[PDB]
Design a protein around this ligand. Structure first.
Ligand SMILES: Cc1ccc(Nc2c(-c3ccc(O)cc3)nc3c(C)cccn23)cc1
Length: 106
């Protein structure tokens, strides 16, 4: 990825993970802990799990060849959120509001 595009992806993922947005990013900072959350059906429902911490790692390890691949993974976090968490639930609302932060920056 180009240098300026890489810098912008890094700024974007750090913005999404920052404590400034803790109230709506905390469920998405690390892979879903299906044992701690008692959700064995998460792996049966969500076939391509993704989280912000994994995206940050993939970025640092040169696994996004352009910004579009980076965006696809960010969108996947929210797609999985809306699939597993029904509309109206607390985590679903957090996904909507964090994706709005991404839309504004991106
Ligand atoms: C029985 C049940 C129902 C809903 C949830 N949602 C949920 C998720 C979650 C995040 C992303 C995702 O793609 C799927 C689930 N993260 C949490 C956390 C950190 C605390 C409490 C609930 N949480 C957990 C258990």
């Amino acid at each position: 990825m180009g240098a300026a595009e890489l810098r912008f992806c890094n700024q974007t993922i750090k913005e999404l993970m920052s404590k400034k947005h803790y109230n709506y990013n905390f469920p998405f900072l690390a892979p879903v802990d299906t044992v701690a959350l008692n959700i064995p059906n998460y792996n049966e429902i969500v076939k391509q799990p993704m989280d912000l911490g994994t995206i940050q790692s993939k970025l640092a390890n040169n696994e996004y060849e352009n910004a579009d691949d980076f965006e696809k993974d960010v969108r996947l976090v929210f797609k999985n959120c809306y699939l597993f968490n029904p509309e109206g639930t607390d985590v679903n609302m957090m996904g909507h509001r964090l994706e709005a932060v991404f839309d504004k920056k991106w």
